[PDB]
């Protein structure tokens, strides 16, 4: 499923991401745009055998188990397939754990490079939330 910007903003708001760990809602929408282009089925294989899954491109080396990654730790205690669902619940709950790891949203490369320090509120403007 490919979310619309405001459709995702609304869903993320319902999931309680607004100001989660101090990150306003726009940060999350912006992160999803650059990580997966709002695509819940996005996947990216890495040179270390791991794979990034879902709308927030969560890595199988640490957060979810896809049973094909060397040195996996499944800290979110979920199968990576749950991160490919049209229902973002699993991605959101894991993202909440990741952003609470100790280094904020910096864990998302796309967020660091295209969202951090920008006017992220722009990402929820017009959404009538």
């Amino acid at each position: 499923k490919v979310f619309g910007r405001c459709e995702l903003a609304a869903a993320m708001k319902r999931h309680g991401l607004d100001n989660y760990r101090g990150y306003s809602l726009g940060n999350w929408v912006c992160a999803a745009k650059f990580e997966s282009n709002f695509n819940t089925q996005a996947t990216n294989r890495n040179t270390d055998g791991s794979t990034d899954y879902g709308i927030l491109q969560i890595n199988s080396r640490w957060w979810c188990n896809d049973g094909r990654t060397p040195g996996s730790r499944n800290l979110c205690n979920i199968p990576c397939s749950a991160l490919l669902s049209s229902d973002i619940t699993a991605s959101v709950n894991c993202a909440k754990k990741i952003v609470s790891d100790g280094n904020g949203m910096n864990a998302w490369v796309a967020w660091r490079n295209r969202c951090k320090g920008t006017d992220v509120q722009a990402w929820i403007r017009g959404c009538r939330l």
Partner: nanobody
Framework: DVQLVESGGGSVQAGGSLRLSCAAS????????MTWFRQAPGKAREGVAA????????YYTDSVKGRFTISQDKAKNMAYLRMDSVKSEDTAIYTC????????????????????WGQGTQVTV
């Protein structure tokens, strides 16, 4: 990829200080963690101090807390290990490690969490 070069190793008397440098080449802000590991003679390699470059947060193994300080110069892809008040137990080959992927903090001092390594520098107390 990332190349890691260490420098600053050598002899130091117990109680003295030494500063190690780790210079990375092959990327800049894609590097996530820059970390120092060490391997004492006849022992297994252990994480000593880790630094997450995008926040400057640091993580230390208990035996060096308060004595060693890891810092960086993000612009130059440099990581430094200031070893203050060294002890005989600190004798070892110090090696720099790095990753271009996020690593949960709880595993930031584990060697298996790193994808790039320097060649090591000897420190003798």
């Amino acid at each position: 990829d990332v190349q890691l070069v260490e420098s600053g190793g050598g002899s130091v008397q117990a109680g003295g200080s030494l500063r190690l440098s780790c210079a990375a080449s092959g990327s800049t802000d894609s590097i996530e963690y820059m970390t120092w590991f060490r391997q004492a003679p006849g022992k297994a390699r252990e994480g000593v101090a880790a630094l997450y470059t995008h926040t400057g947060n640091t993580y230390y193994t208990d035996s060096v807390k308060g004595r060693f300080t890891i810092s960086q110069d993000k612009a130059k892809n440099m990581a430094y290990l200031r070893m203050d008040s060294v002890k005989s137990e600190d004798t070892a080959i110090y090696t720099c490690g790095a990753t271009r992927k996020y690593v949960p903090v709880r595993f930031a001092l584990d060697q298996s969490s790193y994808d790039y390594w320097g060649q090591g520098t000897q420190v003798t107390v």
